[PDB]
Write a protein that binds this ligand. Structure first.
Ligand SMILES: Nc1nc2c(ncn2[C@@H]2O[C@H](COP(=O)(O)OP(=O)(O)O)[C@@H](O)[C@H]2O)c(=O)[nH]1
Ligand SMILES: [Mg+2]
Length: 161
């Protein structure tokens, strides 16, 4: 069984904890302590491979998962322009950690269940294209794109190493 070290990053309130918990416990938490940072393990089969996902949910230890973490989930909320503006910082932070523009990464638009997006799907694709990374729209309330995001990241790690 292979271990995949997965780091979820992004501005506070985007649903980092919600996306993590939905994957692990299969339920939507409406209020998880914004300061709680932890790793959460789950056995998953992705493409006939049994995987141990080691998922650091950054909140603000980190150094290890940033340094030794294999794939990064870059999450903004579609109803939160600032969190999408902040995405540059996190991409930069990762590049700087691993001294490379070739780090497995997925850009994540979360809260796609909410109406009246301020961040267009095209804006987000435009960014991801510019990074050479996938873009996935997710909802931790609906489970929309939730496996897709984590699994695409795993496949990125595999397509990298
Ligand atoms: N409707 C909806 N609310 C969400 C979603 N993801 C997170 N939330 C809510 O957004 C708030 C902040 O989420 P949280 O996971 O604590 O954010 P974090 O700071 O990124 O870890 C909470 O009230 C969550 O229930 C989502 O996909 N849909
Ligand atoms: Mg959190």
């Amino acid at each position: 069984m292979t271990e995949y070290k997965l780091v979820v990053v992004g501005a506070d309130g985007v649903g980092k904890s919600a996306l993590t918990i939905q994957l692990i416990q299969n339920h939507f938490v409406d209020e998880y302590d914004p300061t709680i940072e932890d790793s959460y393990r789950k056995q998953v089969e992705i493409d006939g491979e049994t995987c141990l996902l080691d998922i650091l949910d950054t909140a603000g230890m980190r150094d290890q998962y940033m340094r030794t973490g294999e794939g990064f989930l870059c999450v903004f909320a579609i109803n939160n322009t600032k969190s999408f503006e902040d995405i540059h910082h996190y991409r930069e932070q990762i590049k700087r950690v691993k001294d490379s523009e070739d780090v497995p990464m997925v850009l994540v638009g979360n809260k796609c269940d909410l109406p009246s997006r301020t961040v267009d799907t095209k804006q987000a694709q435009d960014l991801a294209r510019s990074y050479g990374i996938p873009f996935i729209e997710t909802s931790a309330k609906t489970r929309q794109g939730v496996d897709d995001a984590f699994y695409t990241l795993v496949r990125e790690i595999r397509k990298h190493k």
